[PDB]
Amino acid sequence: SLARAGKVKNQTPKVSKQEKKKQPRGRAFKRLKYTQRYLAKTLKAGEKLRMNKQPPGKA
């Protein structure tokens, strides 16, 4: 039947977004990324860079 519709979206607890400083935009953003991965890290001759690595938590 149609008795249960939108059940999950109405059940999930509410959580609010965080407040953060605005990131640079435009040409300043591309500049930030270029130093984010090609500088500011000394991992050279290995190319073993991971853009998004998470802490170990696998329960």
């Binding site: 039947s1 149609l2 939108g6 999950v8 979206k9």
Partner: protein, 140 residues
């Protein structure tokens, strides 16, 4: 091998004309039978009136209820079945309202595990169903 003539262009033209009817893609664009059977008269979207809300089951490996509605079109009074996407989103439809209906992709072929459904609901009361979902707008 085949005909290699230098004066045999007539035979080669006739061959290609006859054999071009054998592919379903080319035949569908030159035959006019598809447009008549298509509830949209060759149009991207269409407007209709909601008749009732139905729940159709999913195909065998899956198991669910897909929450469709029955819609009668306005331009030609044909009846179709359309699927309302996203969580919840059935409470925004109601009965006797007026909706904008679009294709599902694949150009008339059924999509996914929903049996025989090839249309989706886009606008309800001319506001936008996804905008209602994201709360960017309120129902008139």
């Amino acid at each position: 091998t085949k005909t290699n003539g230098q004066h045999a262009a007539r035979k080669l033209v006739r061959l290609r004309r006859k054999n071009r009817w054998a592919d379903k893609g080319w035949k569908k664009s030159h035959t006019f039978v598809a447009q008549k059977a298509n509830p949209f008269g060759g149009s991207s979207h269409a407007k209709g009136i909601v008749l009732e809300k139905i729940g159709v089951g999913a195909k065998q490996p899956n198991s669910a209820i897909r929450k469709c509605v029955r819609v009668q079109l306005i331009k030609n009074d044909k009846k179709i079945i359309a699927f309302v996407p996203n969580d919840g989103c059935l409470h925004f439809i109601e009965e006797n309202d007026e909706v904008l209906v679009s294709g599902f992709g694949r150009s008339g072929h059924a999509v996914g595990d929903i049996p025989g459904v090839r249309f989706k609901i886009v606008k309800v009361s001319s506001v936008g169903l996804y905008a209602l979902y994201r709360q960017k707008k309120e129902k008139p």
